[PDB]
């Protein structure tokens, strides 16, 4: 959602010749969300490792 919403605006700064389809795509709002859910969510606690 976030990255595509940003995509519809990274086309409003055209300055290039034969633009390639790589300058458009962004990455951050994907990892900075996955990683957060993994590192702060209530449903991810240390594995209680007393014994098997």
Partner 1 sequence: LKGKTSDPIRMYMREMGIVDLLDKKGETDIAIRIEEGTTEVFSTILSYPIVIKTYIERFRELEEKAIDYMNSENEPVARYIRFNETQRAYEFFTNLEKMFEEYQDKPNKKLYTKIVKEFDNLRLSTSHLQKLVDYIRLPYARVKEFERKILRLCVERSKTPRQEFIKVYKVGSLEWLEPLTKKYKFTENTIREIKNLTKQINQFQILMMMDIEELKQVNLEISRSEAKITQAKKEMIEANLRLVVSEAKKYTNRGLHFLDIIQEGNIGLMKAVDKFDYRKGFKFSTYATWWIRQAITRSIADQARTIRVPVHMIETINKVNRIKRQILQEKGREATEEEIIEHTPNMSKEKLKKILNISHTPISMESPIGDDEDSTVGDFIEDKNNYSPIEAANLENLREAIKELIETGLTEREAKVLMMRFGIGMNTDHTLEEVGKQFNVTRERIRQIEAKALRKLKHPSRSAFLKTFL
Partner 2 sequence: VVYNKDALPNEKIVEDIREEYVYMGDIPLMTTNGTFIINGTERVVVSQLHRSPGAFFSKDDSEEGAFSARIIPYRGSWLDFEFDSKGIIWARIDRKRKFCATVI
With a CB cutoff of 8 Å and minimum separation 6, the contacts of 7 are 24, 25, 26
Considering only residues 46, 50, 51, 52, which one is a binding residue for partner 2 as defined by CB under 8 A?
A: 46
List phi, psi (to 5°) of 36: -65, -50
Taking CB under 8 A as the criterion, the residue among 13, 14, 42, 47 binding partner 1 is 42
40 binds, among partner 1, partner 2, none (CB under 5 to 8 A by kind): partner 1
Q: Is 34 in the site for partner 2 (CB under 8 A)?
A: yes
Read off φ and ψ for residue 9, nearest 5 degrees: -125, -20
Query: Binder to partner 2 among 1, 8, 18, 50 (CB under 8 A)?
Result: 18
């Amino acid at each position: 959602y976030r990255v595509e919403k940003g995509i519809r605006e990274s086309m409003s700064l055209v300055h290039k010749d034969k633009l390639m389809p790589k300058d458009i795509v962004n990455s951050k709002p994907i990892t900075a969300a996955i990683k957060e859910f993994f590192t702060s969510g209530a449903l991810s606690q240390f594995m209680d490792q007393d014994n098997p």
